[PDB]
Design a protein around this ligand. Structure first.
Ligand SMILES: O=S(=O)(O)OC[C@H]1O[C@@](COS(=O)(=O)O)(O[C@H]2O[C@H](COS(=O)(=O)O)[C@@H](OS(=O)(=O)O)[C@H](OS(=O)(=O)O)[C@H]2OS(=O)(=O)O)[C@@H](OS(=O)(=O)O)[C@@H]1OS(=O)(=O)O
Ligand code: C8E
Length: 153
């Protein structure tokens, strides 16, 4: 009820699109969420997420794409089993390139990130968390799904 924290860790996967094309394969990573309930009805929740996809060519070129976000928002409990939340924060996207010819360069952008999710408590001490997040970084669109689990105490 009042003063309950929930901590969860989860898998995260992004679909990254620009101008009708999708980056292959999808960046993947993790999501950590921390929630604190002020009372039986309202609380706050914070989220960090990161997904990555690396690429290499050998016999030599390499690059990687990384997205991470920090978001937060109110979380409302419906009953003992289910709570819903919305999130707002910042997303940062980065594409980094390097070769044996000397090139080492990146492109990056920070913009708003928007999210929404829910937490399910099959028992009062457990959490299953699922959320979606979206960020537009210039003309690159990053949509991220997250599915996690953890504990409530
Ligand atoms: O270039 S440095 O000698 O300052 O060392 C910085 C290392 O962090 C990286 C990580 O990026 S990654 O390889 O893509 O994972 O860059 C990150 O940190 C820098 C430095 O910022 S700081 O607060 O002065 O230290 C940011 O660069 S800048 O904004 O200062 O110009 C980066 O921001 S940006 O993405 O280029 O917009 C930041 O990247 S990120 O936000 O973590 O994605 C690497 O620096 S980098 O290759 O120049 O980007 C360094 O890590 S590494 O494993 O040595 O490559
Ligand atoms: C894992 C997310 C990678 C997001 C990189 C975004 C870079 C921010 O702005 C760059 C805009 O132009 C750079 C083009 O880089 C291509 C990245 O998108 C690939 C989708 O096909």
């Amino acid at each position: 009820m009042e003063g309950e924290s929930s901590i969860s860790i989860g898998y995260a996967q992004s679909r990254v699109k620009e101008d009708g094309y999708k980056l292959d394969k999808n960046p993947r990573g993790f999501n950590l969420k921390y929630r604190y309930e002020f009372n039986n009805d309202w609380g706050v929740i914070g989220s960090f997420a990161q997904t990555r996809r690396g690429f290499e060519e050998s016999v030599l070129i390499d690059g990687d794409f990384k997205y991470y976000s920090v978001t937060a928002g109110p979380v409302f409990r419906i009953n003992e089993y289910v709570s819903l939340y919305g999130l707002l924060g910042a997303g940062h996207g980065k594409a980094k390139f390097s070769s044996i010819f000397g090139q080492s360069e990146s492109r990056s952008k920070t913009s708003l990130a928007y999210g929404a999710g829910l937490q399910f408590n099959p028992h009062p001490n457990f959490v299953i968390d699922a959320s979606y997040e979206y960020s537009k970084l210039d003309d690159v669109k990053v949509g991220t799904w997250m599915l996690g689990a953890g504990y409530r105490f």
